[PDB]
Amino acid sequence: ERRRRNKMTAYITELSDMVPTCSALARKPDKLTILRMAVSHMKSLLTDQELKHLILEAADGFLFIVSCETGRVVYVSDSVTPVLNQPQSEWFGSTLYDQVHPDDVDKLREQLSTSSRRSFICRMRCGTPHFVVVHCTGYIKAWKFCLVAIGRLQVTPTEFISRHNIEGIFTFVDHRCVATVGYQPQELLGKNIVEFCHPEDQQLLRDSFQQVVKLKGQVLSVMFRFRSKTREWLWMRTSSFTFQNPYSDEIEYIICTNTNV
């Protein structure tokens, strides 16, 4: 083919642009030379440390090895420091159990049993008692045993929130209702939102409800008087929208945001 030879050249060209001792040259050397100036130039020179470096960049991961029988940390890379805000000196020579959430201790015990590939998720402490979610990947290598693994990180009242069935019945409320309306979640759950609205407002609420369903997906806001736990009538605005199943587009429930005015 024609462009066959051209792309070897683009490659070649590229090569010399990138071999400094070749690139820094008065004019461009030939094929046989650049070919032997790159050879000499790398015979000078992926780094062992670099592969490790990429992980940190990419996965925000760091490496560690622990003795399987005890959980004794036989090694931790220093990347524990950028990853965990943790000194290798804080980490090397230690026990993984010291480093996890007391509730991750059990889960941790099962991973280190004599048996292969291993992989799990756990919460670790970072210091200046705070925990972060860490995905651990690795394998068992004898060292009576050690675990070779990588831990990486992961990417990420004025009101209270409710979910309803399309009838207006309460099926979910956050703890801020107590703060917003004085009710215990139990006191709202299972009853119709209609049952909490002032008579003179109730059709608007229903109007609102017939509309948000009909105007599927989208938000509609409506304002009404809510009866507190202490019975006093409270002005409230709730903005809500319908929530549909991503597969079926069945309406899962109505989602409301109910803001004390």
Binding site: A38, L46, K52, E110
Partner: protein, 295 residues
């Protein structure tokens, strides 16, 4: 002379960071692409920093750095292990030449632009079979990879690509804090294993036929919808951390792997099998969030 070039090409191949073995079999175009990419690679790295066999083996995935225009200028060695395709075979080629076109647009925009962070799922060609073996490029399967990394200044995207272990095909050990579930495509429970009871307090009979969305804390519902659609559209997904409402108050933290299961005989999407990683004990045990908890 041809002879005299063929000599240095070999000289170049063996001084490529490669086994004398593999170094020895390269055509010349590849020796270019691999050498080139090695220098290209080496240039990105010094910009960032200012027993690899271990690191390589601890990985549940492979590393890629890709240019804003799609060229795959570096691919870690163990990818062959996951995608069948080897470092040599792909290096210097366009990512878009190996990803589902339905994702190209998505990839493009992850390659582009001001937060640097990147996390997404991609269908990439795989020519190694479940349990060892290998296939030809025409006999390629689509494999979903979970990609996390950062876009970084000419730009580069530096990501880790992890395969999602298939529920019917498990190399890997499971502990206590994990349970299985099956769903219809709308994520309604169609099965749940006995460990759920111990773990969260529900009986499977209480969950069967029940839509997954009603047991999510509501602050999470919108976010999980994304997981669902990903799962459907691409075939597998990893959810974020989420709270699931527990039988008697409060909720648990979860992470779930979902896979669409196919009928090998009629090639119908049969169901969704979920591996659910429980990340905590019950939190806000005191707070009743939903109607079910009443029971």
């Amino acid at each position: 002379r041809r002879s005299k070039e063929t000599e240095v090409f070999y000289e170049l191949a063996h001084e490529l960071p490669l086994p004398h073995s593999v170094s020895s079999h390269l055509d010349k175009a590849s020796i270019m692409r691999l050498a080139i990419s090695f220098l290209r690679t080496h240039k990105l790295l010094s910009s960032v920093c200012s027993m690899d066999n271990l690191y390589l083996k601890a990985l549940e995935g492979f590393i890629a750095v890709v240019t804003q225009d799609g060229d795959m200028i570096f691919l870690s060695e163990n990818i062959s292990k996951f995608m069948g395709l080897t470092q040599v075979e792909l290096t210097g080629h366009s990512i878009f030449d190996f990803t589902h076109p339905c994702d190209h647009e998505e990839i493009r925009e992850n390659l582009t632009l001001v937060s640097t962070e990147r996390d997404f799922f991609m269908r990439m060609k795989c020519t190694v079979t479940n349990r060892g073996r290998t296939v030809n490029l025409k006999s390629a399967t689509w494999k979903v990879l979970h990609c996390t990394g950062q876009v970084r200044v000419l730009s580069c995207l530096i990501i880790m690509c992890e395969p999602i272990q298939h529920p019917s095909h498990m190399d890997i050990p499971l502990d206590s804090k994990t349970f299985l579930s099956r769903h219809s495509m709308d994520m309604k429970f169609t099965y749940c294993d006995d460990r759920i009871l111990e773990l969260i307090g529900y009986h499977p009979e209480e969950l069967l036929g029940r839509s997954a969305y009603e047991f999510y804390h509501a602050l999470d519902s919108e976010n999980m919808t994304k997981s669902h659609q990903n799962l459907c559209t691409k075939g597998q997904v990893v959810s974020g951390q989420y709270r699931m409402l527990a039988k008697h108050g409060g909720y648990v933290w979860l992470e779930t792997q979902g896979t669409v299961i196919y009928n090998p005989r009629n090639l119908q999407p049969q169901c969704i099998m979920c591996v659910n990683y429980v990340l905590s004990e019950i939190e806000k045990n005191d707070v009743v969030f939903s109607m079910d908890q009443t029971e």
